[PDB]
Amino acid sequence: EVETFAFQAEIAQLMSLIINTFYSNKEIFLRELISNSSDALDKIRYESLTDPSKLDSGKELHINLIPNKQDRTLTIVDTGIGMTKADLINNLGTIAKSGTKAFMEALQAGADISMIGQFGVGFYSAYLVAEKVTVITKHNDDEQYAWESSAGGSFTVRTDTGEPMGRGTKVILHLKEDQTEYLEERRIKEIVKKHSQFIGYPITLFVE
Numbered sequence: 001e002v003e004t005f006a007f008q009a010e011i012a013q014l015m016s017l018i019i020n021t022f023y024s025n026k027e028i029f030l031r032e033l034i035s036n037s038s039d040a041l042d043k044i045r046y047e048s049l050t051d052p053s054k055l056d057s058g059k060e061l062h063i064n065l066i067p068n069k070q071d072r073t074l075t076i077v078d079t080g081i082g083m084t085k086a087d088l089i090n091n092l093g094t095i096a097k098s099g100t101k102a103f104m105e106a107l108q109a110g111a112d113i114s115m116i117g118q119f120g121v122g123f124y125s126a127y128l129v130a131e132k133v134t135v136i137t138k139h140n141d142d143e144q145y146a147w148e149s150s151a152g153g154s155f156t157v158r159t160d161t162g163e164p165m166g167r168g169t170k171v172i173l174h175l176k177e178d179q180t181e182y183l184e185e186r187r188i189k190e191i192v193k194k195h196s197q198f199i200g201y202p203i204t205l206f207v208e
């Protein structure tokens with residue numbers, strides 16, 4: 001059973017700006033997602049120091065970038081802390097509301113879309129390049145879920161019956177027709193080198 005939810009008005013407004021503004025520097029989406037994966041990995045690492053059993057769902061702390069020309073998708077996989085149903089439906093939005101208001105204020109005043117990460121809302125930069133985003137995620141305290149949105153004001157959540165991931169998040173970017181450059185090995189390698197070369201976990205770029 002698939003449940004359908006409305007974004008909060010502020011978040012729907014941020015998603016339209018991101019979709020609608022003319023802004024050519026779209027590649028920054030990838031460092032925003034990688035950064036989000038890095039924070040989640042820091043989190044579970046930290047939490048495991050005082051509860052070693054939090055890694056029973058997998059000891060390896062890493063990021064995989066998987067392009068699939070066939071599906072036209074690029075997936076950012078992490079084995080970080082993961083997200084609960086409450087995160088997905090409620091808490092992330094609650095937190096994102098104020099980072100959105102700050103981000104929006106900054107833009108007038110002459111900030112640009114590439115600073116979105118300073119405001120804790122860089123996830124939504126996914127919509128620079130993706131027509132639809134699917135997030136598969138698994139937290140220790142909870143079940144595996146699939147979140148999805150093509151923007152338009154709503155998202156769905158369902159329990160995910162696919163391949164169990166153990167622990168972590170996969171962000172699956174269904175790319176726009178004109179953005180398949182981000183499926184190319186030399187392009188991804190270029191962007192990681194430029195914006196993500198210091199991340200403190202291994203990032204494996206899968207080949208097609």
Ligand SMILES: CCCCn1c(Cc2cc(OC)ccc2OC)nc2c(N)ncnc21
Nearest residue numbers: 036037040080082092096121123135147169
């Ligand atoms: C804002 C920071 C936490 C949420 N989060 C994020 C950002 C985020 C994810 C979303 O998924 C549907 C929605 C909104 C988000 O930011 C507000 N990425 C994560 C990740 N890879 N692993 C764990 N938590 C993550």
